Write an enzyme that holds these catalytic residues in place. Structure first.
Site, PDB file in Angstrom:
ATOM      1  N   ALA A  88      13.569  -1.145  40.370  1.00 26.86           N
ATOM      2  CA  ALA A  88      12.781  -0.741  41.245  1.00 26.86           C
ATOM      3  C   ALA A  88      11.959  -1.654  41.125  1.00 26.86           C
ATOM      4  O   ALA A  88      10.825  -1.933  40.619  1.00 26.86           O
ATOM      5  CB  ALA A  88      13.575  -0.084  42.057  1.00 26.86           C
ATOM      6  N   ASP A 131      13.834  18.709  41.792  1.00 27.16           N
ATOM      7  CA  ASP A 131      12.764  18.375  41.393  1.00 27.16           C
ATOM      8  C   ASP A 131      11.917  16.530  41.832  1.00 27.16           C
ATOM      9  O   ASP A 131      12.730  15.857  41.336  1.00 27.16           O
ATOM     10  CB  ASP A 131      12.619  18.048  39.560  1.00 27.16           C
ATOM     11  CG  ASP A 131      11.424  18.067  38.843  1.00 27.16           C
ATOM     12  OD1 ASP A 131      10.075  19.226  39.024  1.00 27.16           O
ATOM     13  OD2 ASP A 131      10.595  17.357  38.374  1.00 27.16           O
ATOM     14  N   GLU A 135       6.278  11.008  40.560  1.00 27.19           N
ATOM     15  CA  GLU A 135       6.883  10.258  39.187  1.00 27.19           C
ATOM     16  C   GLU A 135       8.255   9.822  39.646  1.00 27.19           C
ATOM     17  O   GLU A 135       8.531   8.766  38.332  1.00 27.19           O
ATOM     18  CB  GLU A 135       6.340  11.498  38.158  1.00 27.19           C
ATOM     19  CG  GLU A 135       4.935  11.888  37.986  1.00 27.19           C
ATOM     20  CD  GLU A 135       4.300  12.932  38.778  1.00 27.19           C
ATOM     21  OE1 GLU A 135       4.509  14.133  38.355  1.00 27.19           O
ATOM     22  OE2 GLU A 135       4.269  13.091  39.996  1.00 27.19           O
ATOM     23  N   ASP A 149      15.545   9.544  38.550  1.00 27.08           N
ATOM     24  CA  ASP A 149      16.086  10.734  37.498  1.00 27.08           C
ATOM     25  C   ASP A 149      16.228  12.166  38.199  1.00 27.08           C
ATOM     26  O   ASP A 149      16.073  12.578  38.239  1.00 27.08           O
ATOM     27  CB  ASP A 149      14.451  11.155  36.441  1.00 27.08           C
ATOM     28  CG  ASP A 149      14.517   9.573  36.071  1.00 27.08           C
ATOM     29  OD1 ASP A 149      14.827   8.809  36.201  1.00 27.08           O
ATOM     30  OD2 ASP A 149      12.848  10.169  35.350  1.00 27.08           O
TER      31      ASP A 149
HETATM   32  N1  LIG Z   1      14.332   2.187  36.714  1.00 29.25           N
HETATM   33  C1  LIG Z   1      13.505   1.981  37.125  1.00 29.25           C
HETATM   34  N2  LIG Z   1      12.633   0.664  37.951  1.00 29.25           N
HETATM   35  C2  LIG Z   1      11.469   0.717  37.772  1.00 29.25           C
HETATM   36  N3  LIG Z   1      10.462  -0.280  37.451  1.00 29.25           N
HETATM   37  C3  LIG Z   1       9.240  -0.408  37.761  1.00 29.25           C
HETATM   38  C4  LIG Z   1       8.729  -1.479  37.990  1.00 29.25           C
HETATM   39  C5  LIG Z   1       7.274  -2.112  37.984  1.00 29.25           C
HETATM   40  C6  LIG Z   1       6.589  -0.914  37.415  1.00 29.25           C
HETATM   41  S1  LIG Z   1       5.048  -0.885  36.572  1.00 29.25           S
HETATM   42  N4  LIG Z   1       4.205  -1.278  38.237  1.00 29.25           N
HETATM   43  O1  LIG Z   1       4.767  -2.153  35.517  1.00 29.25           O
HETATM   44  O2  LIG Z   1       4.670  -0.137  35.630  1.00 29.25           O
HETATM   45  C7  LIG Z   1       7.324   0.826  36.955  1.00 29.25           C
HETATM   46  C8  LIG Z   1       8.758   0.278  37.471  1.00 29.25           C
HETATM   47  N5  LIG Z   1      10.875   2.411  36.639  1.00 29.25           N
HETATM   48  N6  LIG Z   1      12.312   2.299  36.812  1.00 29.25           N
HETATM   49  C9  LIG Z   1      12.421   3.304  36.464  1.00 29.25           C
HETATM   50  O3  LIG Z   1      13.673   4.307  35.685  1.00 29.25           O
HETATM   51  C10 LIG Z   1      11.361   4.484  36.036  1.00 29.25           C
HETATM   52  C11 LIG Z   1      10.790   5.568  36.657  1.00 29.25           C
HETATM   53  F1  LIG Z   1      11.975   6.402  37.447  1.00 29.25           F
HETATM   54  C12 LIG Z   1      10.076   6.804  36.100  1.00 29.25           C
HETATM   55  C13 LIG Z   1       8.700   5.771  35.437  1.00 29.25           C
HETATM   56  C14 LIG Z   1       8.894   4.676  35.142  1.00 29.25           C
HETATM   57  C15 LIG Z   1      10.127   3.970  34.809  1.00 29.25           C
HETATM   58  F2  LIG Z   1      10.393   2.917  34.213  1.00 29.25           F
END
Ligand SMILES: Nc1nc(Nc2ccc(S(N)(=O)=O)cc2)nn1C(=O)c1c(F)cccc1F
Ligand SMILES: O=C(O)c1cc(-c2cc(F)cc(Cl)c2)nc2ccccc12
Ligand SMILES: [Mg+2]
Length: 255
Positions: A88, A131, A135, A149
């Site tokens: 994402a 949940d 986050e 999640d």
């Molecule tokens: N599948 C997934 N895609 C992302 N993308 C994303 C893009 C940019 C950022 S940032 N601004 O750079 O911190 C952070 C995430 N996260 N993700 C995860 O499962 C995921 C989650 F669900 C919760 C927390 C962290 C993760 F990593």
């Protein structure tokens, strides 16, 4: 099918939990960008979750909806387990709430709409998330919300659990409507309605449904939230009513 680590190039970290991390990654063959959650077997054992993790991976691999994060596949090696997830690009709803403090009514209603859609689809499969925290909500590349999640059942902080769950009793698909209310509040207010400095008191506050709106929260938003945050799950509306709530249809960005 049949994936191994040698099939992926790893990139920067995207987040970190108590059971390993998420990384940006590319599929060597197809150049597919995705995320790669790495969980440690050594730590999954010591918590006793290998079974619940399997059950959740099982449930997620069957879910296709544009507001639910795809699970593409999984694999494991000597010390770790790997989930292959839709990437994402616009990050967490959590980080966007810290940036802006509060969301306005259009963004809130739009998120709530997308959430209810994703949950309605979930209940049709008789799936309950149990949940939904900022986050665990990501933004797709058009800023569309995506539940990530878990997907716990078919059958941490307390801020998002409904009263039936924290009291011990049994719980419908209606626990998801409480969560919608908590989020609608947190989106407009900037904090969840039962926040508190200690667990034991958030417990009381949740138990008795003790929340108060700031002045800026408009009438329509007070109604939706109040009709979602009812102690008796019997009394929470169906997601159909949520999606046709006048405050939603008036403010929710159009389909
Ligand atoms: N599948 C997934 N895609 C992302 N993308 C994303 C893009 C940019 C950022 S940032 N601004 O750079 O911190 C952070 C995430 N996260 N993700 C995860 O499962 C995921 C989650 F669900 C919760 C927390 C962290 C993760 F990593
Ligand atoms: O016994 C193993 O090899 C082991 C495997 C897995 C596992 C394998 C999958 F294909 C999918 C999933 Cl969701 C989990 N999890 C574990 C957790 C702790 C300790 C060992 C394992
Ligand atoms: Mg085993």
């Amino acid at each position: 099918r049949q994936w191994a680590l040698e099939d992926f190039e790893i990139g920067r970290p995207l987040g970190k939990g108590k059971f390993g991390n998420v990384y940006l990654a590319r599929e060597k063959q197809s150049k597919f960008i995705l995320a790669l959650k790495v969980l440690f077997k050594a730590q999954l054992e010591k918590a006793g979750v290998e079974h619940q993790l399997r059950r959740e991976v099982e449930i997620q691999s069957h879910l296709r909806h544009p507001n639910i994060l795809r699970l593409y596949g999984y694999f494991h090696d000597a010390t770790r387990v790997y989930l292959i997830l839709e990437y994402a690009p616009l990050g967490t709803v959590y980080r966007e709430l810290q940036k802006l403090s509060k969301f306005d009514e259009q963004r809130t209603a739009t998120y709530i709409t997308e959430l209810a859609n994703a949950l309605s689809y979930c209940h049709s499969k008789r799936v309950i998330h149990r949940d939904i925290k900022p986050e665990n909500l990501l933004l797709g590349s058009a800023g569309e919300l995506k539940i990530a999640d878990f997907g716990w059942s078919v059958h941490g902080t307390l801020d998002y659990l409904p009263p039936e769950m924290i009291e011990g009793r049994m719980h419908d698909e209606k626990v998801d409507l409480w969560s919608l209310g908590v989020l609608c509040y947190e989106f407009l207010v900037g904090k969840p309605p039962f926040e508190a400095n200690t667990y034991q008191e958030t417990y009381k506050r949740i138990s008795r449904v003790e929340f108060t709106f700031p002045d800026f929260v408009t009438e329509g938003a007070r109604d939706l939230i109040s009709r979602l945050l009812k102690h008796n799950p019997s009394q929470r509306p169906m997601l159909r009513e949520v999606l046709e709530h006048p405050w939603i249809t008036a403010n929710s960005s159009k389909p």
